[PDB]
């Protein structure tokens, strides 16, 4: 029952209720660098809770080594221990991941879990 490994409903919680105390378990679907220029890279993540995906996650720069040393990569399952929500001038919310754990490596999971659908706002 693989979707049982993920915090189904956590993305709605974060976006609808603004719940910041949960420590949800999410799957990384994709990771991409953003254009930064003369400052450290920043990574944007498409994450799943098993029900929804959400594309507006960003990694705190302190966690960059996780991506660069390939421990945090597509398909891995993570627990988020600390995150902040920030809102852009245009109204979009960005979820900044400040502390997380990898609970299962990409290589140990191997696939996108379930069939999550994009969260709409
Ligand atoms: C002002 C603000 O709210 N920003 C977030 C933000 C807040 C806080 C910390 C923060 C706090 C602590 C730390 C840390 O420790 O690192 O970081 C980070 C980001 C700045 C910002 C915003 C947009 C981008 C960007 C660019 C590119 C690109 O090129 O393609 N795309 N985006 C982008 C566009 C839309 C979304 Cl929904 C997302 Cl997730 C990213 C980029 C930046």
């Amino acid at each position: 029952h693989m979707v049982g490994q993920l915090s189904r409903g956590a993305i709605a919680a974060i976006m609808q209720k603004g719940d910041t105390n949960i420590k949800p378990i999410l799957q990384v679907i994709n990771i991409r660098p953003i254009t930064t220029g003369n400052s450290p890279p920043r990574y944007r993540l498409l994450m799943s809770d098993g029900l929804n995906t959400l594309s507006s996650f960003m990694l705190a720069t302190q966690l960059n080594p996780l991506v660069e040393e390939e421990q945090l990569s597509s398909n891995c399952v993570c627990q988020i221990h600390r995150f902040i929500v920030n809102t852009l001038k245009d109204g979009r919310r960005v979820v900044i991941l400040m502390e997380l754990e990898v609970l299962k490596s990409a290589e140990a999971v191997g696939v996108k879990i379930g069939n999550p659908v994009p969260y709409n706002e």
Side-chain angles (χ1 to χ4, degrees), residues 4-5 11-12 24 43 47 50 53 62 64 66 70-71 81 93 100-101 103 113-114 117-118 120:
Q5 295 173 18
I11 286 170
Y43 297 103
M47 306 295 269
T53 60
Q62 64 203 21
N64 282 3
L66 298 185
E70 315 188 13
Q71 286 106 341
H81 282 95
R93 260 104 192 233
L100 63 80
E101 193 172 349
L103 294 183
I113 291 167
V117 296
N120 296 312

Side-chain angles (χ1 to χ4, degrees), residues 3-31 33-35 37 39-114:
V3 77
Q5 295 173 18
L6 304 181
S7 288
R8 290 181 282 179
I11 286 170
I14 297 174
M15 304 291 287
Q16 282 165 24
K17 302 197 303 235
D19 192 325
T20 200
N21 293 123
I22 51 165
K23 295 178 177 176
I25 301 177
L26 304 175
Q27 186 181 35
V28 180
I29 302 303
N30 187 50
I31 309 174
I34 283 196
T35 306
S39 200
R42 195 169 290 273
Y43 297 103
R44 183 172 180 179
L45 294 85
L46 177 66
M47 306 295 269
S48 171
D49 69 1
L51 227 42
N52 288 115
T53 60
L54 187 75
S55 76
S56 61
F57 292 92
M58 309 257 274
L59 200 65
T61 58
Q62 64 203 21
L63 299 185
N64 282 3
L66 298 185
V67 174
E68 295 163 355
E69 304 190 30
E70 315 188 13
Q71 286 106 341
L72 185 63
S73 60
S74 297
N75 295 327
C76 80
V77 171
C78 301
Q79 185 161 28
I80 311 307
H81 282 95
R82 200 162 65 92
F83 67 94
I84 295 173
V85 172
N86 205 61
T87 301
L88 307 185
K89 285 170 205 198
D90 66 22
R92 277 181 303 180
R93 260 104 192 233
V94 171
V95 183
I96 305 98
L97 306 174
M98 303 304 304
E99 294 196 339
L100 63 80
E101 193 172 349
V102 181
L103 294 183
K104 297 195 61 66
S105 74
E107 298 71 27
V109 182
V111 299
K112 172 165 78 166
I113 291 167

